[PDB]
Amino acid sequence: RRKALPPRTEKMAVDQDWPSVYPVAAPFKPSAVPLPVRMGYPVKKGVPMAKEGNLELLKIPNFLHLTPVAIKKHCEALKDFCTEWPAALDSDEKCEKHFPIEIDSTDYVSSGPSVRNPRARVVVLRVKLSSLNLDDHAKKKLIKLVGERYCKTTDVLTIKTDRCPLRRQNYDYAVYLLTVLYHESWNTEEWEKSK
Amino acid sequence: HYVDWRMWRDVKRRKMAYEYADERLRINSLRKNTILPKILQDVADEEIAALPRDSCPVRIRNRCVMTSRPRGVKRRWRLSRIVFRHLADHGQLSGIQRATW
């Protein structure tokens, strides 16, 4: 009984705001899309399936949104919000001089309602001992204590922390461990002096 | 409305093993410890022997979710091989193809 109006293809003009008609990620909706894009294995004496009943367009991911024009628009909008990097910091040596203590965490992101995942707790940190210890006795002491967390080829000590589930807990525990390690390498023992 | 009575039994076993999980681990540690008194290890053995059945994690089995098939199941997907091959051929799940390597 009811009949559907013809699609918006002939209605849409050549001058048109594609970023406005497809701002976010969404399905293909050939009724709204004017392009004759077809996709499918053509049959002998045939051609691919027409865009209307071609659900493979929907099977595949969609990237009609996020065109170069939309990207330029969003970057022009968001450059007001982004900040500037210190021009003085323009080299790895300079950045590690300003802040030798490197620290990095990491976490995956996955599709689905649940978001927690134990690997979120991982964290590690790195620092070169060539400038931090300022002494030799404690240097020998701590390099003897640590088993393999050092690397002299690169001249950096690196340590991992996962004993705590929370990233901030891992961070605080690593900081406390480093502090106590320095404080305990400062001093020594008599059985340690006898070698 | 589980698939069958054996699936019902497996679920009861899993639930019992969970709700007695910590206790089983603790007393098993107290049994397998070496330095503590042998009489204490014997008391712990008696405790484990007096514990109820269907509470240990060994009696359960990694059965299928749908077909209740004990064997021929992948631990990752939890499904039986038949159903896996079925819906993979139908292309229901994602990012899986035939290995024509």
Partner: protein
């Protein structure tokens, strides 16, 4: 990955340092050995929280106190 579930503002030292929870036994006995190893494993384990760890501790305390008849 932790929008919520902050472990009730718990602390790394509250997780790891159990010396305050370890008060009702000397520092040499086999019970001390066992509970020190237990605390080591617990501090190593992040999956559980200070709550579960203290329940574990009270569990062991009560059990070996009602089996305190030996002290051998």
């Amino acid at each position: 990955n932790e929008a919520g579930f902050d472990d009730d503002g718990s602390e790394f030292h509250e997780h790891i340092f159990l010396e305050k929870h370890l008060e009702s036994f000397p520092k040499q006995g086999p019970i001390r050995h066992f509970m020190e190893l237990v605390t080591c494993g617990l501090s190593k384990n992040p999956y559980l929280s200070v709550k579960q760890k203290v329940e574990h501790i009270e569990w062991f305390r009560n059990y070996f106190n009602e089996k305190k008849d030996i002290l051998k």
